[PDB]
Amino acid sequence: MTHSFAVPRSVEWKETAITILNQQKLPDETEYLELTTKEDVFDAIVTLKVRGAPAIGITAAFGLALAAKDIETDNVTEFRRRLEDIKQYLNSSRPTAINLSWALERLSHSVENAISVNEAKTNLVHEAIQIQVEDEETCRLIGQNALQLFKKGDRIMTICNAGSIATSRYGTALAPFYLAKQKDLGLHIYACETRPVLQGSRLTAWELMQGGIDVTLITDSMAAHTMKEKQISAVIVGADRIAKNGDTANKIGTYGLAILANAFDIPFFVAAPLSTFDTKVKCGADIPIEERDPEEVRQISGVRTAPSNVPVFNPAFDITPHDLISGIITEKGIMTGNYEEEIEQLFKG
Template identity: 65%
Template sequence: MTQTLTVPTSLEWHEDYLLILNQQKLPNIVEYIKLTSIEEYYDAIITLKVRGAPAIGLTAAYGLAQSACQYEVKTLEEFIDLFQREKKYLAASRPTAVNLVWALNRLEKVLEKVSSVNEAKTNLLHAAIQLHAEDEAVCRLIGENGLSVLKDKQIVMTICNAGSIATSKYGTALAPFHLGREKGKAFQVYACETRPVLQGARLTAWELQQSGVDVTLITDSMAAHTMKEKGVEAVIVGADRISANGDTANKIGTSMLSILCKHFNIPFYVAAPSSTFDLSSLDGNDIPIEERNREEITTIDGTVIAPENVHVYNPAFDVTPHELITGIITEKGILYPRFEESIQQNIGIKQ
């Protein structure tokens, strides 16, 4: 029996602004804010008001397109020069999430076929809107493919937030849970809190509750014990970048889960759209790992919880080696080892 979902979304385009769910305030405050200037878009991305690789890419695309619509230039050459500078500016906001640069490159391709400034402005905005619609369709396909993989499994663990508020809708790793709820399949989800900024606790737990999914929150360090005691049947995670050989960058703590899955003989799945694959990165060593502010570890809501002078190492991501991944769930199907071959055959050169 089909059930009505209340899946929250992160982005909503209006005629002259982007409305985003401010994920800094969740779960206590549900606040939507308007973005109108390119500086506001940059700030929203770098401060994690919007986060999740697909949502970051969409936000950057809207930001660049909207800013371009405000250029007061006379020639197409001037327009393209200003566009390139602002593209570089937005691309520097989050270095690990490949969807960011992918989306900006999609917009850049639009300029190859325009002959006037007005045409460029119109086509760039249409391209951003098209990317938004494509992402929602892609996420639903990922969810359907994820359900096919998890058809005989009910108890599943995840980390970070790879859900509807990290994308346009449904999400990647969380998409099977949202769609499962819609189709009457019940999952029992164990969500790691996810350091350094507790996105599992603040976002995944909140989002799954909105959708009516049975979710239990655990700390990251409880993963091994939970797998053993609660009978976890699968782990599914998202990705911010996947290299040509299948090595996958995701929120810090993901590689730990993959190692535990090998020990307990639990399948470990990555769910991501084809736009997350970076075929120019041969393996995980080519993926840049973002390091973030020390205060994300030494404080909670402004309260200091660590010695003032302690050294802090705060990588936001780690890389899971491809040999620890059971399968990669994409909108084009499920990729299995040997990943270098299956990625080349199914993903190839991204459009």
């Protein structure tokens, strides 16, 4: 079962259905759903039955393609007109993760020159699938490129869950941990539980234990004391959107970790494929930050941890300025210097 990370679990195309692992039922139960309509896909994304930027893009894509089937039309222009309506719909699920819009826009552009309806449908399916297989390679290369940053026995801190179920498989930020365990370098990782949704203790602690990876859980507030007491070597995280300048919007807490890392002068690393980059957003300040249902903070896995009417500020992401970032790892390699210049030279083709 220590190989489960190398197999697709988050989302699978079934031609007539889209099967997704239900992440809200972990760590307790491992259940799979059958999404059949875009309402289902919209619901899975919005309520986090499926989460993690890359995997959300893939699902949204399979979602648009599955839904385009029942678009019984004569015209291709009309087909596009109808297709655009379903796209806007699934795109309004969650704001921050660029991958969502990026996937949808990719499938949209794949039928711009389409000549027939059937050719379009096929295009959508093929383009969706290609997106998934492509994500698999990048994750694989991201895992490789990043491990270069760690020496044997390093203690790495991380936040949220940027692993095998947040992507097609393998993962991004957690990917190098699966490889290091392959190359016997005794890496020790400290996973922040990631409140309020707890992606760290519920998914991260879950999948790494599954892979026979050494992982210790800690609350988020314990970061600082842990960097000191445990002398962690570095901090590696994924991302939901990287601005043209390096500003990375990621799970809420990341920004606090980056400022903490700098204080302890511990390198802070961000790993994410090109699909998560947004070259048209100038800086992090222009990145939409999603604020979710407040009961997220008032309750947990079922019952009360706060009075009912207490007002809460529930942002699901923050922004880490590129200057607190020691490096960003992508499928093409590791950037360090001037990110604006690096981001660009990176999108040569």
